[PDB]
Symmetry: C5
Subunit: 206 residues, 5 copies
C-alpha cells in the first residue's frame, strides 16, 4: 500500500510455499486457552460442548523482514490461507469442530505469527455427578495430528486456563481448568507426539 502490498508480494508470491516443519527445521507452538462457556451436556451419550478460543503462536524465519525496507511496517493481518498453520487437533472430539472466528492471522517482522481461532467442540466426557457440590472432571488432549515431537513441540505460557471471560450465566460453573503439556506414543509410528491436556472441572450452577 504501496509498501504492504509489495511486502506481501515478496513474502508470498515470490518464494515457493513453506512446506511445513521437519526434523531439521522444527517448530514450537505455544498454546493457551480462553474458556467462554460450557454450553451443553448430554448424559445419554457422554458428550459435552465447549466454546473457547485457542491462542496459537509460532515463529518462522521465512516470514522475517526489515521494517525500514518496507516503510516502517512492523506487522500485518493476513488470511490464514496465505501461510502455514499447525494442525492442532482434539484427540477425543465426537463432531467436527465448528469455527466461530474469521481465519485471519497476525504476522510480525521477527517472523512470529499469532492465530486465535474460536471454536465449538463436542468431546467425550461423562457428566455423572455434575449435579452435585463436588462436580465432575473431564479432559481432552490437543496436539498435531500428523507431526511428531521432532517436528512440532508444544508449550504453554501458564498451566492456568483463562477463565476471566467465562459466561457468568452459563448453566455450568467452572471450578478449575488446566492446560498441561504431555507426551504420547502411538502404534503407527516410532516417535513421541506432543499434546496439551485441557482438564476442566465443573458443575450445575446454584
Amino acid at each position: 500500500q504501496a509498501n504492504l502490498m509489495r511486502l506481501k508480494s515478496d513474502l508470498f508470491n515470490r518464494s515457493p510455499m513453506y512446506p511445513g516443519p521437519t526434523k531439521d527445521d522444527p517448530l514450537t507452538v505455544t498454546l493457551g486457552f480462553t474458556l467462554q462457556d460450557i454450553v451443553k451436556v448430554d448424559s445419554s451419550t457422554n458428550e459435552v460442548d465447549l466454546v473457547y478460543y485457542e491462542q496459537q503462536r509460532w515463529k518462522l524465519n521465512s516470514l522475517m523482514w526489515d521494517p525500514n525496507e518496507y516503510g516502517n511496517i512492523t506487522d500485518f493481518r493476513t488470511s490464514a490461507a496465505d501461510i502455514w498453520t499447525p494442525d492442532i487437533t482434539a484427540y477425543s472430539s465426537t463432531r467436527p469442530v465448528q469455527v466461530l472466528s474469521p481465519q485471519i492471522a497476525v504476522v510480525t517482522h521477527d517472523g512470529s505469527v499469532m492465530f486465535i481461532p474460536a471454536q465449538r467442540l463436542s468431546f467425550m466426557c461423562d457428566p455423572t455427578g455434575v449435579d452435585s457440590e463436588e462436580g465432575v472432571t473431564c479432559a481432552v488432549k490437543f496436539g498435531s495430528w500428523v507431526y511428531s515431537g521432532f517436528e512440532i513441540d508444544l508449550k504453554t505460557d501458564t498451566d492456568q486456563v483463562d477463565l476471566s471471560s467465562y459466561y457468568a450465566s452459563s448453566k455450568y460453573e467452572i471450578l478449575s481448568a488446566t492446560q498441561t503439556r504431555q507426551v504420547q506414543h502411538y502404534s503407527c509410528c516410532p516417535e513421541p507426539y506432543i499434546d496439551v491436556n485441557l482438564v476442566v472441572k465443573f458443575r450445575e450452577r446454584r
Copy 2:
C-alpha cells in the same frame, strides 16, 4: 454496460488487491442492526437465537472514480468477493453464524461501500425471567476479530436498534434494543479493540 464492465475492470483487475487497513491507513466501519425475530430460546443450554440483518458502511480511496470518465455512473452492485470486507464477528456466538442473504455489496463513486448481510445467530444468553412482566436482558458484542482500534474503528449512526421490521407474531416482544460502541482489551495484545454491544431486553408475548 460497456462503461460498467470497463469501470470494474479498471478498479479490480488492473490494480493489485487492497491489503486491508493498517495503522497508517485505518478505517471506520459504521454498523446498524435491524432485528427481525427472536426465534428460539433454550433454557437448558442458555442459548438464544436471533435473526437480523447488519448494515455495514465504510469507505476506501482505492474504490473512487469520476462518473464522467465512465458514462455518469455513480454506483454499482458487486460480489463481496471482488472487494475487501471487515471481519465483524460476534464475541459470544455458540454456533457458526448462518448467512441468509446473498453476498453482494454496493459501491459508490466516492469510495463508499454498503454491505448488509442477513444472519441467524446463536449466542450466550440466560432467558430465566423471560416469562415475567419485567422480562430478561441479554447482550452480545460485535467487532473485528483480528484488527485493533488503530486499524478498524467502529461507530453507529444511532444507539437505537431498528425494530420496524420485527416479526409481529414472534413468541417474544422486544422491550428495548440497543447498539453502543465500546472499548475492550485482551490478554493477547496491548492495543484496544472496538466493539458495538447489542443489548436486547425481551419477554414472552402476552
Copy 3:
C-alpha cells in the same frame, strides 16, 4: 457439438462477464411458484417449512445469437455458474435455503433464460388455528436483496400459485396460495424494492 462448444466459447470465454443490471439497462424477472409440500410446522418457534420450485425468466441481449451461424441451434442447457442470475431472496427466512435441484439453466437464441431451482425454506409463520376448519394464513416475500426496482422489476404470469404438484398426502391441505407483486421501502435506501408476496392458507387433515 462442434457448434455448441464453439457457441458457448463465443458467448462466455470471449466476452467480459455481464455485470448485472443497472438503472440504464434494467431487467424484469418473471417469477412463478410450484408448491409441492408444507412439510413441517413448529408452533414453539413459529417456523414453517415449504418445498417448492421457483421458476425464473429474464432476457439479455448479451446472450443472443443467430442460429444459422451456429448449426441451427435454438437453445442449450448450461451451468448457472456460466451466467448472471438474479439474487431472488426470501425476506423472512430463518435458516439458509436448501437447494434440491441441480444448478443448470436453459438459454435461448433470443437471449431468454429460464431457471427453476427447487428449495426447502423455513420462514416466520404462526400456525395457531391450523388444526381448525378455517385454517391459518402465512406469507413470505421474495425479491432481490440488493437491487432496487430501478434495476430489477418483478412480475408474475398469474397470481395463482401452481398447486398441481402438491403432495396429495401432506399433513397440510392448501386452501389457497397466491403470488402477487408488491412494493416495499427500507431504512437504508430511498428507492422502492420489488417483491412477489407468496401467501398461503392451509390446515391439518
Copy 4:
C-alpha cells in the same frame, strides 16, 4: 501407466469439454436401484428416509478409444468431475440428497460409462398404516431435472428393484419394490420429460 495417463490426456485435456446431450446427439441412461435400508419414518411430517445405491449407465462416442493404440486397455476408473454425468433428480425430495459413496466412475473403450452413487434420501411419503400387516405404499420419481426426452431418455433393465442387500434387521420390512419408466409433461415446456418411478411397499417388524 504411461498408456493410461496418455489415454486420459487425449480424451480429456486435448478435446474441449463435452457440452452435454442435445436433440441431435441425445442419449439414454439406464437406471437400476439397490435398496439397502428404510432408515427412518416421520409421521409428523410425512417424510421417509431411504438408503440405496443407484446404478447409472450411458454411452458417449466422445469417450471411445481403440485398445491397441493404448496398450490393450479396455477400461478405467476416473473422477466423475472428469466427465459429464446426468442430472438425475428425485422429484419429491424434502432435503438435499446426501452422497455416501466416492464420486468415481468406470469408462469402457466402447464409450460406455457406469456410475453408482450411494445416497440417503428424504422424500414425501405418508406412513399411516405402516404398523399393520398390509403395510403402506409410497413412491418417488427420478429423472433429469432440466433435459427433455429428446435429450435424455431413461430405461430400466428390469422393473424389479434389487432387494438382495436389504438390511435384515431394519425397523421396516420391504414387501415389494418397483422401478418403472414414465412420461411427464410440464407447463414450462412443450416437450415430454422422462422419469423412473420407484414404488416401495413396507411395514414395521
Copy 5:
C-alpha cells in the same frame, strides 16, 4: 527448506498425476482400526454411531526418491489432495462420514504412504439386547467402492481391532471387536471385490 520444496515440485508439479491402480499395476492397501467410542445408539432407526481412526498404508513407485539427491530427506507430510488416496468406503453407512482429523499424509522415500483419517460414522445396526449381559453384535464392511480385487487388494496386520484408546467411560463397553478380510460379488460386475469386515460386539456399561 530448499530441498523439500524442490522435492515436492519434482514429485507433483513436474509429473502427470498418478491415474490410480489397474489390473496391470494393482495395489494392496493395509487397513487397521482404532476404536475410540461408541457414542450413540438409536433403536428407533437402528443406527449406531462410531468414532475411530482408520490407518491406511500403501506404496507407489511414482512416489520414490533418492534421499541423497534431496538433502538426506527420508519422508515428509503433505496434503492428501497432492496424492492419490484409496476410495475406502463403508458399505452400510446411513449418513456421510464426518471427518475429525486434518487431511494430511506421510510419504516415505521408498514410495510408502500412511494416512489415518479419524471419522464419525452412522451405520446400520440393531441395538436390541444391548441392555443385557450378552450384549449385541453389529458389523460393517469397509472397501473400495469402485475398484475390484484385481486392482485393489486389502489386508490387515492383525484381525484384532485396537481397543487400547477406547473411551473408558463410554456408555457402551466393548466385548470384542474384529477386522477381517473378506470377498464379495455384486450384480453389476463379474469380478471379486474386497472388504475388511469390522465386527463389534458391545453392551450398556455396568
